[PDB]
Design a protein around this ligand. Sequence first.
Ligand code: HEM
Ligand code: HEM
Ligand code: HEM
Ligand code: HEM
Ligand SMILES: *Cc1c(O)cccc1OCc1cccc(CO[N+](=O)[O-])n1
Ligand SMILES: *Cc1c(O)cccc1OCc1cccc(CO[N+](=O)[O-])n1
Lengths: 146, 146, 141, 141
Amino acid sequence: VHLTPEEKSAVTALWGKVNVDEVGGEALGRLLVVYPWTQRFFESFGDLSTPDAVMGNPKVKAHGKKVLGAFSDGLAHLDNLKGTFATLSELHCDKLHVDPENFRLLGNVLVCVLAHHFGKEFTPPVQAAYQKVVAGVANALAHKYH
Amino acid sequence: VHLTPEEKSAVTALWGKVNVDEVGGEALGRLLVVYPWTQRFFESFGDLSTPDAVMGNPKVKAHGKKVLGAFSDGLAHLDNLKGTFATLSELHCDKLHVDPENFRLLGNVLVCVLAHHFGKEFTPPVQAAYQKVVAGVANALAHKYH
Amino acid sequence: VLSPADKTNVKAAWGKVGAHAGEYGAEALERMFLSFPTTKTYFPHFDLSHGSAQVKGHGKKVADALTNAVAHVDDMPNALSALSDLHAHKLRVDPVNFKLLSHCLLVTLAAHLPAEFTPAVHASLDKFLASVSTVLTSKYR
Amino acid sequence: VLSPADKTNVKAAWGKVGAHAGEYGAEALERMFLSFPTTKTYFPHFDLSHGSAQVKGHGKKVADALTNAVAHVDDMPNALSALSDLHAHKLRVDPVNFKLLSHCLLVTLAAHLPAEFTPAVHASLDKFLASVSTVLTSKYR
Ligand code: HEM
Ligand code: HEM
Ligand code: HEM
Ligand code: HEM
Ligand SMILES: *Cc1c(O)cccc1OCc1cccc(CO[N+](=O)[O-])n1
Ligand SMILES: *Cc1c(O)cccc1OCc1cccc(CO[N+](=O)[O-])n1
């Protein structure tokens, strides 16, 4: 809840080009690989012993698609991030006790994946506008701690 | 913040013995020494060049006393920490751009000082009640980011 | 990265703990479980009621590793290799929990060794614990 | 703490930067200044306008120091002692700013080298920059 009109335009246009069937699993997969302790929260997901097992785990890719849908929900409701995520905030904060610094990490992993797939088109201005998206999502998901 | 009636009695009892001329200055002083980057916010305070200079600094002692008085005010209004600190949050968030992790560091530095001063009277359940307070204070100060 | 001064601050201050190692280890564990109840989820098989013999003996194991880490401050990765495999590979502890325990250790030392707990020593001890924490949470084998 | 494979991944990926050091270094800084405007206050006397020759010249210094850090990955505190004087003793840089610059470097690397930015290499570069960041923000003399 803090985006200028030109930042909303830039994030909406880029997101219309996002493959919402692959980007979620790529980001959840990299979160599990780059920050290994987060695998502890996904003990029922099966094989997570190597980068290849993680990125090829079909439960990781299926759940990442749910992640990305909820990020899509937030992008269509950019001025009401608190309410869009309130119920997920209860689950992540009151039931799962994921420390909120992990919400920041996933948001930034997602930013790296967007850069990875778009190359030169993920320009410093597009990145900066997306930095306020993922920071608002992290903040919203941490609301039940607040 | 949810303190039981027995936690509030023991928080109140300990706080009424606190040395209001020294405890705040020691907490702010230890913050500037243990986390030296925080000195960047206090350039006009004079000599911060060594530990001894920081702790003896009269501007540090005077500023720490005002920090302690805000915590006193949050103790008196546990039911409404957000309204109690609304303008300090504007100052610290909108004007100073203090990163919220620093709020938690000061809260825990204060806890260490309480333990330093009161010794074994600073029991673990007394610590547990104090951690809820400083987490409460620290959350209310970060609200202008929320 | 500790300075030579950090190292001498930490040895002197932790030298004072002496035979209270297990008492202080247990106290710091109890401080962490009471103040930050989610840290308990790493010890579901433990008896965590106050004064538990299991926590007490585990506190002693923690302080002794700290005592060992002080003596090997200049080759932490070799010395801490076994505890790193436990905490990073097998247990996968979230780093925020190391900050909470570290803070409860500082609280314990301040409450018992007020003359040792100087602003400079407080800073070196915080850095020592942050450095041990980093090694225990890194998968470097 | 870096594993042998982390060092292998870092050396191989950064070697692919090559002549694009200052270009990528400058691009990271401009991402950082723009995504996180508070970082500009560490450079109050700089010309931070887009494309400014000063930021180019400064981005090249960053990348060259990183190149130096890659080659001295097993000798970090000694090789980086002067940069730690600057950032930790003189500029007292808040460590969260190092996470921001490190993230912006990763973004730049992913934008320019998509084939080499694999999950495993991503994870090694993150730890490498976190390791360089720890050294630059700690006062160890
Ligand atoms: C920051 C943005 C995040 C978003 C948008 C997000 C979104 C979601 C969604 C939509 C669900 C499914 C809820 C349901 O179907 O009931 C979920 C579940 C879950 N999340 Fe996240 N999440 C985020 C961050 C994280 C992080 C950082 C972690 C841990 C490191 C985490 C741990 C989990 C776990 C363990 C589950 C349950 C998986 C299961 O069913 O076993 N989340 N999340
Ligand atoms: C987390 C608990 C904190 C509390 C309760 C607190 C309280 C206060 C109070 C009462 C003032 C005086 C404002 C006035 O009288 O107008 C103040 C000012 C200030 N605070 Fe804090 N503060 C906290 C954290 C921090 C931190 C962590 C930093 C920096 C790292 C910081 C930076 C400043 C600065 C620069 C000023 C202005 C000093 C001056 O120029 O006069 N605050 N704070
Ligand atoms: C910060 C410094 C820490 C040190 C020095 C340390 C040291 C130790 C030691 C010596 C052991 C026993 C090894 C053995 O069984 O031979 C142990 C085990 C263990 N640690 Fe820690 N640890 C630290 C941090 C943490 C944290 C922050 C957590 C979680 C909040 C944690 C969770 C555990 C668990 C669950 C065990 C297994 C205990 C058992 O089942 O016997 N550790 N640690
Ligand atoms: C991987 C991380 C970093 C590396 C490798 C790095 C490296 C360097 C290098 C090589 C210089 C030039 C020093 C000289 O030539 O004398 C420098 C200067 C400087 N750096 Fe960084 N740095 C890093 C992170 C940061 C961050 C995050 C900030 C602030 C947000 C920062 C603030 C500064 C400042 C203020 C200067 C002084 C420039 C001047 O006033 O002339 N550094 N750094
Ligand atoms: C040095 C430091 C600081 O200041 C804060 C957090 C973490 C660290 O480093 C931890 C670390 C990493 C790798 C090796 C070592 C020990 O190196 N020596 O052998 O001295 N510590
Ligand atoms: C190893 C590590 C990790 O995983 C995360 C943050 C910081 C560190 O290490 C910091 C550090 C301290 C001392 C030395 C070094 C590397 O220098 N060497 O040449 O070993 N890193």
